[PDB]
Amino acid sequence: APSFPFSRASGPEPPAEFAKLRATNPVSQVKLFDGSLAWLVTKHKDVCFVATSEKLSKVRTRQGFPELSASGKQAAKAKPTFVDMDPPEHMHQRSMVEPTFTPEAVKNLQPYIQRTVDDLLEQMKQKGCANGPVDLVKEFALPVPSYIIYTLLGVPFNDLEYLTQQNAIRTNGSSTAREASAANQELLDYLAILVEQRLVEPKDDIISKLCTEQVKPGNIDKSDAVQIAFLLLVAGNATMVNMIALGVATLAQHPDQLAQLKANPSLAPQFVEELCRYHTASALAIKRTAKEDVMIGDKLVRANEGIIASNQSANRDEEVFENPDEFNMNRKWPPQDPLGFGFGDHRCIAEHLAKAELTTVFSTLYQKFPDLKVAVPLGKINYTPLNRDVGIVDLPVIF
Numbered sequence: 001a002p003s004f005p006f007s008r009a010s011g012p013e014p015p016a017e018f019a020k021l022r023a024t025n026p027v028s029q030v031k032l033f034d035g036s037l038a039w040l041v042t043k044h045k046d047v048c049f050v051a052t053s054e055k056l057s058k059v060r061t062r063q064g065f066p067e068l069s070a071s072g073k074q075a076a077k078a079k080p081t082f083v084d085m086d087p088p089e090h091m092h093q094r095s096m097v098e099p100t101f102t103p104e105a106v107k108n109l110q111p112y113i114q115r116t117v118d119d120l121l122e123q124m125k126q127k128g129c130a131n132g133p134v135d136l137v138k139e140f141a142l143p144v145p146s147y148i149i150y151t152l153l154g155v156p157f158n159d160l161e162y163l164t165q166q167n168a169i170r171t172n173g174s175s176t177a178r179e180a181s182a183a184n185q186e187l188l189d190y191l192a193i194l195v196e197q198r199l200v201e202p203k204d205d206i207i208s209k210l211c212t213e214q215v216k217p218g219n220i221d222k223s224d225a226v227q228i229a230f231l232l233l234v235a236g237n238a239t240m241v242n243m244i245a246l247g248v249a250t251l252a253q254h255p256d257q258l259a260q261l262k263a264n265p266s267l268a269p270q271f272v273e274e275l276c277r278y279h280t281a282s283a284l285a286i287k288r289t290a291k292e293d294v295m296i297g298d299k300l301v302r303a304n305e306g307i308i309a310s311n312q313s314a315n316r317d318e319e320v321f322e323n324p325d326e327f328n329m330n331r332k333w334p335p336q337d338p339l340g341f342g343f344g345d346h347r348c349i350a351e352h353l354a355k356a357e358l359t360t361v362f363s364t365l366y367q368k369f370p371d372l373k374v375a376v377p378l379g380k381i382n383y384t385p386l387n388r389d390v391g392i393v394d395l396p397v398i399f
């Protein structure tokens with residue numbers, strides 16, 4: 001069995017292994033860092049099955065759970081939040097924070113999302129690029145999602161820049177382990193103060209709702225409120241940053257589609273749909289252990305065996321998505337959902353928010369900056385390391 005995770009074939013490409021597995025070995029065993037095994041599931045139909053089967057568990061205290069790194073094994077010791085829960089605990093906790101993220105809530109947030117994007121673009125414009133390129137990541141792709149989720153959580157405006165920087169340190173490839181861990185605990189300590197404050201004087205934010213609706217009645221404790229808030233911050237932010245950067249790069253890669261998007265910003269939703277399929281920037285989250293034997297395709301997954309269901313591979317499944325390796329914002333979509341946000345009850349809580357952020361970016365960026373260009377050759381883009389999820393570290397631009 002080959003070692004997993006696999007490395008991407010090149011900066012912007014999926015691992016090469018998946019297409020071969022879909023063709024000849026769609027349910028197969030891989031070897032994890034600890035020498036254990038796990039079943040890797042590569043076809044769309046089977047990924048959806050894994051994501052929804054009640055015979056499979058997300059609880060990380062089950063032997064067989066496919067931890068992919070030493071750090072993941074460590075992390076599984078803590079008290080879980082809803083990301084790692086099964087029913088009925090899962091929705092009991094997730095429903096505490098769902099309201100902000102519903103389709104209707106996100107539609108009503110659109111003016112705020114637009115204003116946030118607009119303001120960050122105007123700052124660019126004012127900073128300019130007269131002395132040479134600026135980094136679209138630092139100036140734009142990072143602060144857009146960060147400012148939004150911090151604001152929704154309850155962070156006041158004057159603390160956004162510093163906290164945006166500190167959360168980036170958690171995941172920056174250049175951070176040492178000490179720097180990343182110190183930033184993690186710094187953010188937790190910060191959120192703990194905000195919970196104390198909002199318990200005394202609630203405001204218009206997610207932490208206040210946790211405090212009033214869950215902490216005060218005794219349904220959760222203050223520490224639980226901190227960890228739920230922290231999950232909402234860290235689960236998606238680095239993925240959002242990467243998706244923005246990858247979208248800009250992809251448009252540059254495919255000039256005629258950029259021309260189409262400038263000419264018609266109403267194409268932004270379908271651009272974003274294609275982006276979230278083609279660049280599956282969170283590919284390692286659909287993991288389970290079997291609670292009892294389960295058949296998947298021509299394989300038997302025995303009780304206490306682990307499963308990794310690749311939504312990245314599902315999103316390139318030729319049986320579902322015709323010409324899957326073509327980026328086509330005018331794609332004729334099938335009935336089956338793309339899986340950029342997962343599937344089933346655990347499907348990304350923030351899918352509607354994330355798509356609204358991305359649609360706002362891609363309907364606005366090239367109206368603001370019709371001459372935006374990546375300022376290095378596309379083949380020189382600095383992608384995330386190939387043994388990680390797809391992403392872009394920095395992206396020099398002019399405009």
Ligand code: HEM
Nearest residue numbers: 083235236239240282285340341342343346347348350354
């Ligand atoms: C384009 C950006 C994003 C992508 C592609 C993405 C993708 C995903 C994926 C693949 C999962 C796993 C779902 C499953 O288990 O089937 C997930 C879960 C989750 N995401 Fe996102 N995410 C994004 C942005 C966000 C944002 C902005 C937030 C928070 C504000 C967020 C919060 C979460 C949470 C809390 C979960 C766990 C849900 C659960 O297990 O019940 N995500 N996301």
